[model samples]
Target: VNSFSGYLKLTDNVYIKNADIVEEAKKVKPTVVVNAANVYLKHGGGVAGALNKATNNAMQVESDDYIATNGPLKVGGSCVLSGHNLAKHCLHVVGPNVNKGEDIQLLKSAYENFNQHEVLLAPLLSAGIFGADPIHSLRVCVDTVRTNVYLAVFDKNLYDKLVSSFL
Candidate 1:
C-alpha cells in the first residue's frame, strides 16, 4: 500500500491495532493477529478500537480542562494486563503455559521496572514467548525480576553482587 518495494505477511491470530492495519492486513490474510493496545498510546477504541485501548483511553475519558489523566497503577506491587484485543479474536494471552502453573513470572515481569526504560524493555519484548507458555514464564519472569528488584532496591552492593552471581 506504500510504494510496494518488498513484501510483508499479515497475521490475524495474535493482535493488530489500527483499523487501517486490519484493513491493510486483508491483503495478506493473516492466520492470526496480536491486536492489543497501542504502545505509543496514539489511538483509542473509536480511534484505536477495543481490544487494546489506549492506556489513558481505557482508564479515563478525555478532558479539555485538566492536564492529564493518571495511568492504571499496579496492584500487589504488580501491573495488570494493558492491552487486550478481544475484538479481532486477537487474544492477549495472559494465555496458558505449556508447563501448566509454571513460568507465571513473565506477566509479572511486565511490571518489572528497572528505573531505566531501556533495561525494562530488554526483557519486556522477549516475554512474548512466555505468553505462549505463560503459566511458567509468568512464574519465572516475576520471581526473577523481583529478585532483581531486591538487588536494585535494598542493597546496591548486594544487587551488583546478586547480578554477578547470575551472569
Candidate 2:
C-alpha cells in the first residue's frame, strides 16, 4: 500500500475546480473529513448527500442513528464518527438554516466546533443547499484555519477568495 504525506505545507489549500470532494480527499487522505448536514442528519442534500453516496450509506446509518437520540444538535454542534468510506474519521456538523439569517454565524460555529487536528478535508459549508454564497463560505472556512486544511471547491468564486485570502 502507498502512503501520502498528508501535508499541504501551508495550513490552508483551496483545491480549485475539484468537484469531487471524495476523490480529492482520497489523494490528501486527511485525518478527518467533514460534511455539512442539517441538524437532523437528513443527509439528503448538498455535500452531505454527495458524501452519503460516496460512503454507500455509511454516513447515513451512523449519523442518522446518532443524531436521533443525541440530537437534534443546535447549529455549531457536531460529532465525529468513523469514516467508513471517506477519511480515517468523519466529522458531521449541524449547519444553520440559511433561512434563519444566521448563515455566517452558524458556519463560524461549525468551523470552530471542530478539534482542529493535523489534517482535515472540508467542503464549502453552507455554500450549496444551505444557500450561502461560495465566496463568503470560503472566507469563513479560511478564517478557521489553525492547521493544514484542504478545501474542495468547484466554483471560480472560491478560487478568487482563496487567492485574496493569502494576500
Candidate 3:
C-alpha cells in the first residue's frame, strides 16, 4: 500500500488517512469495510465499484441477493455481507442524497449503525455523489464512530480540508 499523504489521530485507535480506500482495506484487513452505497445496493461505480471489482464481483452478488430479499435499503440504513477478498465482512450503508434533502441525522446514523465492529474501514459517506459537505461529513465520522476506524479519504482537496480542520 502507498504511504498515507495525510493523517489525523482522532484517538489512539480511531484515525483518518488520505489514502485509497481499497488499498487501505487490503492492508488493514478490518473486521468490516463500509461501503457508501445507493439504496439499491448496486456496486456500479465509485467506492462500491472499486470494492466489488477487488472482490471479483462476489460482493455484488451478495448485494443483489440482499436487495432481493430485503428490498431497497432506506437512507441511513445499513446491512452486512461477505467481503470476499477484502475484509471479513462489508457493511453497506446508504446516506441521504442532499439534492433531495440534506438530512444530517441520517448521515450520522449511517456511520453510527456500524460502531459495533472492532476494526472498521470506511469512506466519507454522502460526501461523494450523494452530496454531503466534506467537512461536515468528516465531523460526523469523527463524532459518531466509537470503534477503531480507518477513515479512508480519496480526494486530495477534501483530504487537505479534513487535515486542516484538525489544525
lDDT against the true structure, per candidate, is: 0.27, 0.68, 0.81
Indicate whether candidate 2 or candidate 3 has the larger TM-score.
Answer: 3
Top model by TM-score, which number?
Answer: 3
Q: By lDDT, who's the top model here?
A: 3
TM-score of every candidate: 0.21, 0.78, 0.88
Candidate 3 Cα misplacement greater than 4 A, ranges: 1-7, 100-102
Error of 3 at 6 (Å): 8.4
Q: Can you write out model 2's per-residue Cα lDDT over 1-167, one digit (the tens) per residue? A: 22333323333343333445777666656678888867787788678888888888878898878877786767877887877756888887876767657656767778776545666677777776677776666666667756556666656565556556642
- Indicate whether candidate 1 or candidate 2 has the larger TM-score: 2
Cα RMSD, each candidate: 15.9, 3.6, 3.0
- The TM-score that candidate 1 achieves is 0.21
Residue-by-residue lDDT tens digits, candidate 3, 1-167: 32333457776666787888899878767678899888898889889999999988988888899889989998898888887878888899888778667576798888887687877778988887777788888777777887777788888888888788752
Candidate 1's error at 140, in angstroms? 17
State the lDDT at 28 in candidate 2: 58
Model 1's alpha-carbon lDDT is: 0.27
Pairs that collide, model 3: none
